[PDB]
């Protein structure tokens, strides 16, 4: 009766702010900001001494469909956290007011639609990381895709039709095979669960051919080599919020799903088959970080940059070693900071000022925007993997973990520091230097909100870069929960 009364009051407050105020930009900010105050107090009461799942709730049980349940028979949808599951929630919740802010003075046409869609595809990726069944992980692994389709189609820049079709099609096409491999282990085990499946072994001939259905499902989501067709051409026509929340949140989900789904029940099917993961991760690092060099568009470069770092990260997960797991987690938490800041630089600030994203118009940004050329350089040099930034801690530990498992593939894959410097510094010194361009009237300096976003996304890299241990208190069980070296 009490928690019903809270909802009946809050929906009424929402109704009256809809009535008097026109936009709900302010109430969406207020709600998404209170999500921080909630999740940090959840972090305070988090017991770090237990591998255990602390905060558990079932929705949609038989005996109580609309709400919570305490029964001895459970067929609802489980939810909970530990450690691993919690670092990515904390990555999420301090980013969604920044994408909700990110289009503040921008939209001007059906703003109530847009901010509803952005907040909704942020809440769905909160509950992605809360989920505990294979189906409750999966029923929110594609509740994003409708709202992503409509957020790209309406509000996309130009040629947003094709990008919206790609973000439905490729993700769905790789996702149905994940559904196959979930169906097979839900008719063999009769349990969808993230708690018990350490206990259940499978035949190697069974475990072999259900690892395919999940691996070529995460090959699409973190785009590996026969995929990443779609990644740059969903970025290059996205709006501003749906590019930040794509590249900071949707990509790290399959980094989370290769940990949560694959590694602890596919334990014996991987050690036969990690040296296909090393093939695919290396020739995404070698190939996709080499096609960055020849790119006329400016958002497409930061798209392929996201591909190259996510290809470094999944040869730290698939190392079956102890440094690589933590290195890939700190990659996922630091790339999700440094990368949406770059999308604020490319289609955030510069497309708001000049509305065309070809590189060839853009030189001499220093003479009339000095305190943007600083954010060009320190944020680029944060993307390359200069130390003290939190990207290098992740790149270093993941290249080290991938050097344990197979040292020749690690020695070849170490060249990524060079290959990630080449295109990023080539872009940085084209934009930063030269005479201020002919085509370009002088527009405003970078404004107070587009500094307030940036300094948050820069301090949050620098704190991880000075101390990567500020989140070892969470992760030290999940460094061990995934090793099978007997």
């Amino acid at each position: 009766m009490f928690l019903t009364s809270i909802l009946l009051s809050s929906l009424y407050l929402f109704n009256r702010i809809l009535a008097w105020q026109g936009n709900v930009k302010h109430f969406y900010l207020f709600a998404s900001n209170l999500l921080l105050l909630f999740i940090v107090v959840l972090y305070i009461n988090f017991n770090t001494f237990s591998n255990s799942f602390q905060f558990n709730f079932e929705l949609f049980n038989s005996l109580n469909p609309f709400g919570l349940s305490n029964s001895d028979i459970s067929n609802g949808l489980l939810f909970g956290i530990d450690g691993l599951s919690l670092t990515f929630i904390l990555l999420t919740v301090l980013l969604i007011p920044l994408t909700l802010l990110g289009n503040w003075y921008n939209i001007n046409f059906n703003s109530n639609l847009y901010y509803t869609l952005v907040l909704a595809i942020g809440l769905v990726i909160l509950l992605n990381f809360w989920a505990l069944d294979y189906i409750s992980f999966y029923i929110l692994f594609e509740a994003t895709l409708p709202l992503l389709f409509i957020l790209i189609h309406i509000y996309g820049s130009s040629d947003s039709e094709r990008a919206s079709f790609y973000v439905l099609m490729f993700t769905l096409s790789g996702s149905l095979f994940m559904l196959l491999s979930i169906v097979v282990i839900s008719i063999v085990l009769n349990t969808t669960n993230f708690i018990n499946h350490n206990l259940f072994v499978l035949s190697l001939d069974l475990q072999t051919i259900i690892w395919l259905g999940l691996f070529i499902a995460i090959m699409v989501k973190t785009p590996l080599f026969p995929i990443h067709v779609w990644l740059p051409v969903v970025h290059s026509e996205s709006p501003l919020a749906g590019s930040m929340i794509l590249a900071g949140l949707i990509l790290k989900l399959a980094l989370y799903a290769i940990l949560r789904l694959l590694l602890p029940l596919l334990c014996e099917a991987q050690i036969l088959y990690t040296p296909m993961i090393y093939i695919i991760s290396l020739l995404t690092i070698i190939l996709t970080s080499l096609a960055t060099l020849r790119q006329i568009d400016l958002k497409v470069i930061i798209a392929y940059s996201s591909i190259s770092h996510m290809g470094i990260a999944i040869l730290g997960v698939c190392s079956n070693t102890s440094l690589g797991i933590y290195g890939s987690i700190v990659l996922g938490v630091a790339h999700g900071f440094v990368s949406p800041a770059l999308f604020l630089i490319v289609g955030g600030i510069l497309y708001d000022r000049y509305h065309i994203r070809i590189v060839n118009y853009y030189k001499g940004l220093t003479t009339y925007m000095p305190q943007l050329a600083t954010y060009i350089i320190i944020l680029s040099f944060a993307n390359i993997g200069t130390p003290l930034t939190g990207n290098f801690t992740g790149e270093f530990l993941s290249l080290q973990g991938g050097f344990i498992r197979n040292p020749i593939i690690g020695g070849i894959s170490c060249i990524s520091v060079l290959l990630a410097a080449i295109y990023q510094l080539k872009l940085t010194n084209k934009l930063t230097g030269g005479i201020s361009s002919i085509y370009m009237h002088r527009t405003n300096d970078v404004t107070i909100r587009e500094k307030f976003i940036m300094n948050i996304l820069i301090i949050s890299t620098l704190i991880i870069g000075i101390c990567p241990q500020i989140m070892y208190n969470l992760l030290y069980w999940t460094v061990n929960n995934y090793i099978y070296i007997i």
Binding site: N75, I139, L140, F141, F149, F165, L176
Partner: protein, 469 residues
Amino acid sequence: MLILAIISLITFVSMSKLSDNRAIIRLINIYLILVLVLDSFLYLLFLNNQTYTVMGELLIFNSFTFYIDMLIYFIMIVISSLYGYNLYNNNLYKTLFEPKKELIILFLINILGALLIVHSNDFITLFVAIELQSYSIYLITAIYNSSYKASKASMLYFFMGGILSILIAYSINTYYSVLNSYTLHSLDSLIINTLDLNLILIALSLGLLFKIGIAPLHKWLISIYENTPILITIYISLIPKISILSYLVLSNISINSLVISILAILTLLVGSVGGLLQIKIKRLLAFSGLTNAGYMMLLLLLNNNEFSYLYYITQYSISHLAIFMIIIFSIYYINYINNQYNPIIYVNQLKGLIHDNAYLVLSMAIVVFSFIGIPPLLGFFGKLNILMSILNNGYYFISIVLIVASLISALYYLYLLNVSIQDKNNILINSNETVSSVLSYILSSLIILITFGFIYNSLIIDIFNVYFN
């Protein structure tokens, strides 16, 4: 209590005038509502999959059949709530969508013909009931006589239904020739080993299956669906499909059938690639009928298909019903109206529908995502529970081609949205008259079932467990 309605209303419609037809249909609608409300306690008769054979080894009453028997009345209330009720109160909307005098008679004669198949045990009840419902489709099609396409469509449907009726009667006669009995339980699992029955039982299956749109013979049905008026075709696309598919699924005469597996694959191929380059909306919509009626020969190959079937049928019937009612709403906002019987013909015509109203496109978006299996929707678990039975019983290439068919099909489901959320140049600022209240409340309810049926998914599984096992 169908025939208590039919015998009464036929005398009632014989004497009423042409103006009274709307209020006659309103009466029959409310009658069917109260037959569903005051008489739906007959679920208690079965409690452990208890089956009754009634009228002397002639009808068969079990709980699968009770659920289909309840489903058909529910969708008939939604269909009859269309002809009863005005869409708008305008000159156009009276001269469009006029119900004929004998239409309400032929609906309930068709429901008698459709119910006496799902409840059927004997072959002679099968044959008399496929004949009763085939006549009713011959005459529901042709009742709009002053239409060129509708008369050509009824005459085509006549001869094709006639060939498949004689093929069924030949199979029934042939099974009688090899075994004295007519009932299907004279099989009782010892015949089929020691007896070559595969050819008879497939020809009995294929006789009904080709009446529905099994894909070597899919070309005639698409033509009939595109040629009838847009309100005959929601009924004559729903009813014969679900009636005979729950027949063929209740009585599993073709297990491991290679002919059925080929034609299942061929259906999933040619439906999903036939709907790709098509500009007419009832076409696109009828091939969406074809692929989804080809997730059906699959379950027909199975044994023990009564969770997957029933869940997917009520999924499909709600989704079907809702998207036809969406384009029946969409005809007010379009700029061009041809062809009085069939007012919207092209999917190019419903452009810019979001700038006219946004919530009809919100409705259209949830139904078109429910067709393509999007996971928080009710249409997802239908494909999920087909796949928990296809893979359960060894059909692995069937599963891969099922997936590829779903992906190729989503490409022409999403064309409806690609058209409907675009800039139009001529937005509506004020409509003077508003759409009928109950006829939009029905679509709102059919949405909220689709978007919130995963709430009650778990209750349904427990209920199911009690009442079919």
